[PDB]
Structure formats: structure tokens, C-alpha cells
């Protein structure tokens, strides 16, 4: 079906403590294959998958680059929100970035997103039309006025549509064999003890997506098992029946726990 | 790859 | 390791004629890459700036290209007119080095 | 827009002079370059809100600093014939990767000997 690519940015200040701590992550799907850390000794771009290794030294450099310029741009900025919202230079705050592009079965472009946190609420977000901003508060609206000065969406949406797009259409095939495959679950169910309760387990699948009395269920949140796999279980207070339907299966998967 | 964009807040 | 190369240094051409200046790049991780103009009093004055991701841009009868992946930008100047007579510098935004290139000294003849 | 002192400047060898620069209203960032015959236009040094950002070829015997004013001088002591050219000034909003820099008139200094 449809792909994904996302870069994930979070920079925390720490006051006294030195430089804000920056750590920026890249997924395609629900893939991890790029990282950097600025609390390593040499802080460089590390690869996280096998398909992401064969990039030659210019690939790197450049990514270490962009992180680099990504951990000043954000220590900047952390200063400067401190005079929009009078906040003390003593207070550890925390800056948020995610920016992707989502492209469909055909490869072309269906959504790109660019948005910004401050302290975990929305600061600024590149609204759909990859054009115009909505800033959430009024400092954010001072942000605003800037990026459209200096016609930051433009580049942001040059990069959507074209860089995002053509390098995640790469990616996807340099790693077709991982990327492109969905694992099914390994479903079973347990009991534990006039009541007692019903466990629907699903174990071992990709991508995380997956579907398992919508009030008294009690489901946990999809978890990783460590080794890209995912894990996900349900509960209830023969009657009963969990519901599996997953991209990997051929056929919505109905179970009763046997005795 | 990633975005080169610098555009402080 | 940016070396940015410009093809002609020099153009004489009759007014009206369209105009092909070509620009050439090392180093494809830029922020921008931007044609400035030159004249001998005023200083250099931005005509074109070509985001990081863009492939073209067009103001009037100003229209660059830009080809990250073989390190080229090419400036066409539709009609030529005499007041365009002035030296044209291709400019590049690396991380934390900008670099200029030779320049096209442009005189059109009216 | 940006303004330069002076517009020209004739000196000695060994000698030591100031350029300054008055960027922008609202402006930053400050840039200075150096254009010569045999190297072209060079980037020198780039401040931006007080703080040193970056740096070209910019040679030991060359100082330079942005004012809290935002005006900024570029110092060149010690000088010689090869720093004979033309000087300029530009100015941005700030650091933006997205946005051009405004260049300033130009100082022209010739150093004999």
C-alpha cells in the first residue's frame, strides 16, 4: 500500500548543564535506519539499517551536516522562545520537529508534513497546502511572519514534493526485502481466574499496524519486541471472540480461546 | 536524505 | 572544495537576443543557489534565488534552472535589453562557506 | 539599504585601516567580502546578532566585530599591495537558508607602497 518517511527531531536545554541535548531519528514506514546523537564524543549520522549502509561518504556528510546545523538552529531557537514567552533561563524546555512526506502505491505524493512543538504543545505546523502557516499562539505568530518573509515554505515545499518523494521511492527498493514485506501475527490466547479474564495476543508483526464489547476491552499500545517486530494484546472481564485484521494476513482472523 | 532548511523561530 | 566555474566571461551580444549564461558547482550540498548582478556603482544586487530543492525560478524575463545532482545552473535572459549590461555572479550557500564564481561581464549592444 | 565607510581609500604599506558598515534596518546579519582581480569575490566573516557565525579565507591580520547597534568594522592592519580591492558589506533578516543578503556600495581600497 502506501509509504512513509519521517524525521523525528527533540532538543532539550539543559541549564548549567551545558548545550541543549539533540537527538533526531529517521523511520521510512515503521522502519528506524538514521540516527544522531549529540552526547556521543564525535557526533556523526549513524546508519540503523542494511539498506541505508551502501550510501557513499557524501551521503553521510551531508546528513551530518543537516543534524549539525539542526542542533544549532534548535539551541537558537530554545534561547529565543524564551523571549517570546518570558520564560527563565534556568528551565529546561523541550523543541520538537517532525517533518515527511507520505507517498501512495503509485510513488507519487500524497501528504507533506513540516510541524514544530514547544514544551509538547504545537508551536507551528506547514498547513496541507504545503503554502501557508497556522501558528498556535501569538509568539508562534511572530515565527509565522518571519518564515513567510523569508519564504521558508517554498523550500520546505520544493523538498516535499520532490527530494522527499524520490529518495523515499529509493529507499523502498534498495530494501524491498524488509520494507515491502508485512509479517503476520503469531495469535494465541490465554486465560487467567466466578470471573476471570481473556487474553488475545498478537506477536511478531509488521508494519505496526493492527486491529484487535468496545468498553470494557482493555487494549495496551502497540510495542516493539526489540528486533522490529511488534507486539499487541487484548483483554475481557466461548461467548467472546477477538477480531485480528492485519495487512500481512490473507484473512481477517477470527479466534475463541481454546480450552 | 534530509531537508536542508535553516529557519530560526 | 565548492569550486563554482562560470561559462563566458564575457558576452557582447545585440539587444534583443536570448541570452544563455551557465554556472558550475562541486559541491551539491547547497542551502541556495542565487544570481546576483553587478554594476560598478551600485554593487551586487540578488536576481534569482533558487531554494535547496527548487529547480527553477522566473522573474520576468529572468528564468535559472538547477541541477543539484550534476552541479549546474543555467540563467536564460529572454530579450536582451541594454539597461541587463552589467557583470552576472552565481552565488552558492554551502554549510557555513557562500562562494561566488568568476562572472559573466554582459554588454548589450542597443 | 546598507551603507559603507568610506567609499574610497587610498593608503601605504604596513598601514592599518577601519571599514564599517551600516546594515539594514532590522537586518542581523552582517557580511563581509573581499573582491580582487585574482581571486574574485571571497567570503570573509559572517556575524549575526553580536555572535561570530562563519568564516571564509579570512586572513590573521584581518579583524572584524558587529556592534550591539548592529553596525558593523572590519579592520585591516599590517596591510600590503594584495590588499588592494573591493570591500563590500551585505546584511540579511537573519540566517535564513531560504533568503538573499543585501550588499552595501563597496569600499575601494588601493594600498601602495
Known amino acids: 500500500g502506501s509509504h512513509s518517511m519521517r524525521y523525528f527531531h527533540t532538543s532539550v536545554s539543559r541549564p548549567g548543564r551545558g548545550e541543549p541535548r539533540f537527538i533526531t531519528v529517521g523511520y521510512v514506514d515503521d522502519t528506524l535506519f538514521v540516527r544522531f546523537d549529540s552526547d556521543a564524543a564525535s557526533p556523526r549520522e549513524e546508519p540503523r539499517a542494511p539498506w541505508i549502509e551502501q550510501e557513499g561518504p557524501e551521503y553521510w556528510d551531508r546528513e551530518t551536516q543537516i543534524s549539525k546545523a539542526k542542533a544549532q538552529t534548535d539551541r537558537e531557537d530554545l534561547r529565543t522562545l524564551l523571549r517570546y514567552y518570558n520564560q527563565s533561563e534556568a528551565g529546561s524546555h523541550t523543541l520538537q520537529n517532525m517533518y515527511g512526506c507520505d507517498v501512495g502505491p503509485d510513488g507519487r505524493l500524497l501528504r507533506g508534513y513540516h510541524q514544530d512543538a514547544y514544551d509538547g504543545k504545537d508551536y507551528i505546523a506547514l498547513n496541507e497546502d504545503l503554502s501557508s502557516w497556522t501558528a498556535a499562539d501569538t509568539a508562534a505568530q511572530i515565527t509565522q511572519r518571519k518564515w513567510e518573509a523569508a519564504r521558508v515554505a517554498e523550500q520546505l515545499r520544493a523538498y516535499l514534493e520532490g527530494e522527499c518523494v524520490e529518495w523515499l521511492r529509493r529507499y523502498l527498493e534498495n530494501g524491498k526485502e524488509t520494507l515491502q514485506r508485512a509479517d503476520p501475527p503469531k495469535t494465541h490466547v490465554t486465560h487467567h481466574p466466578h470471573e476471570a479474564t481473556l487474553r488475545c495476543w498478537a506477536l511478531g508483526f509488521y508494519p505496526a499496524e493492527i486491529t484487535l464489547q468496545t468498553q470494557d476491552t482493555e487494549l495496551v499500545e502497540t510495542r516493539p519486541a526489540g528486533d522490529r517486530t511488534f507486539q499487541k494484546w487484548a483483554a475481557v472481564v466461548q461467548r467472546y471472540t477477538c477480531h485480528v485484521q492485519h495487512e500481512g494476513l490473507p484473512k481477517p482472523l477470527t479466534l475463541r480461546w481454546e480450552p | 536524505t534530509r531537508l536542508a532548511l535553516i529557519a530560526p523561530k | 572544495k565548492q569550486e563554482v566555474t562560470q561559462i563566458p566571461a564575457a558576452l557582447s551580444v545585440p539587444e534583443g537576443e536570448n541570452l544563455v549564461l551557465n554556472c558550475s558547482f562541486t559541491?551539491?550540498?547547497?542551502?541556495?543557489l542565487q544570481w546576483f548582478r553587478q554594476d560598478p556603482g551600485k554593487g551586487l544586487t540578488s536576481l534569482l534565488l533558487?531554494?535547496?530543492?527548487?529547480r527553477e525560478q522566473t522573474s520576468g524575463r529572468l528564468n535559472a534552472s538547477l541541477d543539484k545532482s550534476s552541479g549546474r545552473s543555467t540563467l536564460y535572459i529572454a530579450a536582451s535589453q541594454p539597461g541587463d549590461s552589467a557583470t552576472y555572479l552565481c552565488a552558492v550557500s554551502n554549510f557555513n562557506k557562500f562562494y561566488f564564481g568568476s562572472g559573466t561581464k554582459l554588454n548589450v549592444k542597443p | 539599504g546598507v551603507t559603507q565607510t568610506p567609499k574610497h581609500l587610498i593608503t601605504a604599506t604596513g598601514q592599518r585601516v577601519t571599514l564599517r558598515c551600516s546594515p539594514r534596518?532590522?537586518?542581523?546579519?552582517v557580511y563581509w567580502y573581499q573582491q580582487s582581480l585574482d581571486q574574485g569575490l571571497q567570503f570573509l566573516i559572517q556575524?549575526?546578532?553580536?555572535?561570530?557565525?562563519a568564516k571564509g579565507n579570512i586572513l590573521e591580520r584581518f579583524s572584524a566585530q558587529q556592534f550591539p547597534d548592529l553596525h558593523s568594522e572590519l579592520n585591516l592592519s599590517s596591510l600590503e599591495l594584495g590588499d588592494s580591492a573591493l570591500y563590500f558589506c551585505?546584511?540579511?533578516?537573519?540566517?535564513?537558508?531560504?533568503?538573499?543578503?543585501?550588499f552595501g556600495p563597496g569600499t575601494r581600497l588601493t594600498v601602495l607602497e
Open positions: 534596518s532590522g537586518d542581523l546579519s
Open positions: 559541491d551539491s550540498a547547497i542551502y541556495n
Open positions: 533558487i531554494q535547496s530543492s527548487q
Open positions: 556575524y549575526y546578532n553580536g555572535e561570530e557565525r
Open positions: 551585505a546584511s540579511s533578516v537573519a540566517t535564513y537558508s531560504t533568503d538573499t543578503q543585501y
